[PDB]
């Protein structure tokens, strides 16, 4: 049975970056040629793993994280990066061993008048640990006065909405990102590639 790589790539709906989805690839064989042959990817950068050699390898588990961000924020999805997304939404480890695949999705996730379903986190006390997911909607206390769940002065809702419209600039157009993380623990490797003995 093949690994469900098309299940996360050609999915009709994606998640917001603060609530990024994760598919745990386990107990299947992969066909990484299908990922490389697709020339519609505007961003395809692999850190650590060799893409061609990746075919003839095995791993304990694989993780496919999917979300949508802006165009000018795709650079933040990289090991050792800083910004709003990399610190309060989705953080990659500095020793990351995987691939980041991002493609423009203005013709899918954009709506005239504004697609306000995709959100991101604006305020957060501490940065996000690698592969951490914070989906809390607690009113952020920006001052010394408690908020008590009510929004007001120095009490901000931590989630900002992307104004995704088909007429936006390239930097503000929606981009779908898929991050593949190959975890090789001291366990039976159950996710092998095409050329495995």
């Amino acid at each position, epitope marked *: 049975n093949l690994c469900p790589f098309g299940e996360v790539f050609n999915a009709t709906r994606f998640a917001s970056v603060y609530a990024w989805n994760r598919k745990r690839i386990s107990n299947c064989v992969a066909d990484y040629s299908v990922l490389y042959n697709s020339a519609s990817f505007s961003t395809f950068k692999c850190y650590g793993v060799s893409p061609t050699k990746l075919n003839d390898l095995c791993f304990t588990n694989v993780y496919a994280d999917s979300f949508v961000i802006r165009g*000018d924020e795709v650079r933040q999805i990289a090991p050792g990066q*800083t*910004g*709003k997304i990399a*610190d*309060y939404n989705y953080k990659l480890p500095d020793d990351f061993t995987g691939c980041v695949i991002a493609w423009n999705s203005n013709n899918l996730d954009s709506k005239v008048g504004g697609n306000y379903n995709y959100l991101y986190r*604006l*305020f*957060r*006390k*501490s*940065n996000l640990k690698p592969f951490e997911r914070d989906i809390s909607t607690e009113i*952020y*206390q*920006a*001052g*010394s006065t408690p908020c008590n769940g009510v*929004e*007001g*002065f*120095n*009490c*901000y*809702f931590p989630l*900002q909405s992307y*104004g995704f419209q088909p*007429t*936006n*600039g*390239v*930097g*503000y157009q929606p981009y779908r990102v898929v991050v593949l993380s190959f975890e090789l623990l001291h366990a039976p490797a159950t996710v092998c590639g095409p050329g495995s003995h």
Partner: antibody
Amino acid sequence: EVQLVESGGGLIQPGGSLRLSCVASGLTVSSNYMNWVRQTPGKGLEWVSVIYSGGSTFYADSVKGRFTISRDNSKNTLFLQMNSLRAEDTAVYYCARVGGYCSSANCVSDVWGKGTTVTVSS
Amino acid sequence: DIQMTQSPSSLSASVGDRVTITCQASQDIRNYLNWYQQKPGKAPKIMIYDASILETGVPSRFSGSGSGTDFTFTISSLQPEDIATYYCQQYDNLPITFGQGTQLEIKR
């Protein structure tokens, strides 16, 4: 209201250093996007540095490598260290929380300080 | 970076006249644009949030409109309590950029 009282501006020879301080009242500097912005009388307003609540810092190209933004949560004060000061850095510096990111009901309050004059000459 | 162009750099208008100031961004900034008013000697005060939102305390004669790459700041009936330098600022994209400025002069 929110008060941002600043200090540290003064005469400094080229190449010297200077630490600008900005004490806040009614605002937690460790929980906001705090910005340093200098205004030359001839050129206008110019963004200098920003620090995030999580600790991330960013500086402008005319400023990178020379300045450094930081904060002290116990004193609730925003600091801007300036090294290798050039004559072009002569301006009035402000600390502020740039407002915006408005929802339908609430906005982030935009509050600027009073400003300190940093002069760089021989 | 995003270059902000503010027009005009200086304008003179009588009391009660309609004042209009245009601002253009080098690229799309959506509605993330603020308008500041700086009195002579004072610090820049926030005047318009996110192109259209009016700061509390600002009179109703002030107004703001526009989106994308073109914005306008309008004063319906000018009063002498408004003479200052006005700036348009874009955030959400570092470096935060401002306009060149617009001096306001009351004709008499």
